[PDB]
C-alpha cells in the first residue's frame, strides 16, 4: 500500500526481474523516485546491489514530505520555459530516452514550470 510495496515493484522493473541489478540500472532506479547522492556517497555503494540493500537505501535516501525536492531548481521554479526550448536542453543532455520524450510532455499538459512537472511526477509515482 505504502512506499515499501512500491519500491519492490520498481526493482523488478529496472533489474528486469534480476536478483542482482547492474550498478548503472540501480542509479536509474534511485533517480526515478528523487534520489541523488554526492560524489563520495556514490562511491560508498556496494559492488553487487541486491533487493535487500536497495530497500534499506530506499528508506534512508527517499524524500517523503516532498517526494521530488531535486526538481525545484526559486529562480528555475517560478520561471516559464517554452515546450520547444525545454526539449532543446533535453535532446543535448539525454542519457536515456529515444521517443518516450513526447510522452513526458503529455504527462505535464506551451510555457511550463518545474513546480508543475514535480507535482505531476508525484502523482505518477
Amino acid at each position: 500500500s505504502d512506499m515499501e510495496e512500491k519500491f519492490r515493484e520498481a526493482f523488478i522493473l529496472f533489474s528486469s526481474c534480476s536478483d542482482h541489478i547492474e550498478m548503472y540500472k540501480f542509479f536509474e532506479l534511485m533517480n526515478s523516485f528523487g534520489i541523488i547522492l554526492t560524489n563520495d556517497e556514490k562511491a560508498a555503494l556496494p559492488n553487487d546491489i541486491n533487493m535487500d540493500y536497495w530497500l534499506n537505501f530506499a528508506k534512508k535516501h527517499y524524500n517523503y514530505e516532498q517526494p521530488f525536492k531535486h526538481i525545484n531548481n526559486e529562480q528555475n521554479t517560478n520561471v516559464q520555459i517554452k515546450i520547444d526550448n525545454f526539449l532543446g536542453i533535453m535532446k543535448a543532455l539525454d542519457t536515456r530516452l529515444t521517443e518516450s520524450d513526447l510522452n513526458i510532455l503529455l504527462q505535464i499538459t506551451s510555457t511550463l514550470n518545474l513546480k508543475t512537472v514535480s507535482q505531476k511526477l508525484t502523482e505518477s509515482i
Binding site: 519492490r8 515493484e9 523488478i12 528486469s16 526481474c17 534480476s18 536478483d19
Partner: protein
C-alpha cells in the same frame, strides 16, 4: 469436461441451497477450470457471494476460457526475456507471479517452479504446457 462431477461437487460444498464464490472457484479448480479475479468479480455484482445452481452454471461458463494457449499467457514472461535464450531464471519467474495479477504468495509460486523442474533456467514455453493441463 465432466458433467457428473459438476453436480456432485455443488451439493457437497453447498449451504442452504446457495454456493459461495470461494467454493464455486474451489469446485471450478476441482474440475479443471481456471477462475481469475476478473471472472470472480463479474459474478459478485449480480446475486451476491452466495448463489443457487441456476447462477452457479453461469459461473461454470465464465471459468471455461476456451481461447487459452501457449502464446495467450506468455505475454508477461516473454516481456522479461531480454537475454533471448528462452530459458528464464526460477527467481525471475518467481517475482513476476507474486507482484502482479492473481495474489500468488512466495511459497505458492516458489514450490510451483521446483515442482515443474529442478533447474534454475526454466523455459516459460514448456512451463505453459503443463500448468494449462
Amino acid at each position: 469436461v465432466d458433467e457428473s462431477d459438476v453436480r456432485i461437487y455443488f451439493n457437497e460444498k453447498s449451504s442452504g441451497g446457495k454456493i459461495s464464490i470461494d467454493n464455486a472457484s474451489y469446485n471450478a479448480r476441482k474440475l479443471g477450470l481456471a477462475p481469475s479475479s476478473i471472472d470472480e468479480k463479474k459474478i459478485k455484482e449480480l446475486y451476491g457471494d452466495n448463489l443457487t445452481y441456476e447462477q452457479y452454471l453461469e459461473y461454470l461458463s465464465i471459468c471455461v476460457h476456451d481461447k487459452d494457449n501457449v502464446e495467450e499467457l506468455i505475454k508477461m514472461f516473454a516481456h522479461f526475456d531480454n537475454n533471448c535464450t528462452g530459458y528464464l531464471t526460477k527467481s525471475q519467474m518467481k517475482n513476476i507471479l507474486t507482484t502482479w495479477g492473481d495474489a500468488l504468495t512466495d511459497q505458492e509460486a516458489i514450490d510451483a517452479l521446483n515442482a515443474f523442474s529442478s533447474e534454475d533456467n526454466i523455459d516459460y514455453k514448456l512451463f505453459c504446457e503443463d500448468i494449462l493441463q
